[PDB]
């Protein structure tokens, strides 16, 4: 259990420090032998090494079994050359560890439906996992350029690119409700066809898992009308963006969402929220996604699924019991974390 | 007021006939001098001309001021060469008339919130219009091709391409709640940057309208968390596709959705539903989307905004008063229309 902690900027340290407080308490109670070391990353690393992902930090993650990420970015670095911008650092961490799967869970915990924008009956039972490809797609496709009267961007996918993500999706589904849904736009684009036949072809090795294809727009609507029926949803870069964001609102607020990026290298877990610079050091940040990030870390990086599910509910309990500001409450970072540590400990 | 009516297939005729009933009554009442001619289109046109968009129908829409379309497609023609499949007909109509804007309204009528997937409070008040570009984007971007190990599609946009659609959006918002929202992914793609500065640049000629920029994924979330705060939403082809569809589920049912496609040629108005061939001639089809497609026609093609808003409510009343089966009711096509033409 060697974890490389990278607090980052803004509320990163506030919230990551909360997750570590929950980790250390589980460590004491069941003695998993946690071991962690924080490393400068993001804007911090810049203000100290002129680079967002300095070698010491680069070497820190390589040697760890998992990485616990905080927030990244802010005003102090917007005016810097994209080459070393805080965000391009996230890119180098993903590229360096060949992480290509982005796991974004959207779940409604029993007794919390009321917080959802959807009807109690529609929201009840939601538990979907959008698996998104992080390396390919339109975001990186070339050629890409601008002009006085024309703009172009190409969406391109390789065979090996699609196989892995698809394999992660199935593997993942095998451990859950065994239903995978591949989402594309094969009815119009060649890339969707390609994707479809490829996934189709890789799903052969997983007969025990039910594969179902859908178009992105059809899915856009199925995820609001019947979100409770899905399990694992695998899709491309941009589509995974549009779809993870959409699903992320089904539980209520955005600061409730963890994330993991799986690949061949060291796995990365991080909240899906930003630095929120202005509210830093104000004790009002919600560590929910941070803790939830440490739970996904426990289950997908260490296998402690029984334990991850343990902190998950302790968090659910706390959100209902003593809700934080952003969810209509007075419980600040410190307080909230107290309620959670209480149960997990 | 010369209207080219294309009933199509499936429930097309059933529902198009219902909208014509509502139109003829208004025409009697205020005497707007409606004039209409039905033309064979879709499967029907195929069964009779071997083509889905025959020259006689081609010439019928050219000469009309508006086009009232029904449904298209069905089992009888799925096994045909895509070159003359019923659906490719819809594309020939579009391409022949240079229709670039695709208006797809999603609105929850007061008293019907309960039908929505959203909570009564969140759904209440929704009235959003997603204007989508129909000619450009990744759907037609070249180069596009497949291979043994590689697939590629290119999303490209021209300057003139984006101006027009942005112009439609503003002009439309001017007549509504004066709030336009452009949607892109300018934070990552060059196409989004180009679209943003272009729309930004045309919005200058519309100072009275408030422009707002958002990224497709942000919007995918805002349109379920706070749909009631938007008015006109303009976007690209693929993005308009994912967004229209998402918004279209806000109002309880699919059959309550009209749509219009504006361009340089004859404007086209049609339900956002299919042929539902097995339920044809059963009298249970809901004409709401067709009627509402006649309203949109009235406002957007003939300027009768006061009139269109008149049929709109008559429809709303009817939905609450005598609701159709798909909405939990016994009121069949014929009966529902009765309750509508009564008010209008």
From Swiss-Prot, chain A:
Result of altering residue 139 to F: Large decrease in activity and a small decrease in substrate affinity
Site (Important for catalysis): 139, 185
Cofactor(s) the protein requires to work: Mg(2+); Mn(2+)
UniProt KW keywords: Amino-acid biosynthesis, Branched-chain amino acid biosynthesis, Cytoplasm, Leucine biosynthesis, Magnesium, Manganese, Metal-binding, NAD, Oxidoreductase
PANTHER family per UniProt: 3-ISOPROPYLMALATE DEHYDROGENASE (PTHR42979:SF1)
Function of the molecule: Catalyzes the oxidation of 3-carboxy-2-hydroxy-4-methylpentanoate (3-isopropylmalate) to 3-carboxy-4-methyl-2-oxopentanoate. The product decarboxylates to 4-methyl-2 oxopentanoate.
Name used for this protein in its record: 3-isopropylmalate dehydrogenase
Organism: Thermus thermophilus (strain ATCC 27634 / DSM 579 / HB8)
Gene: leuB
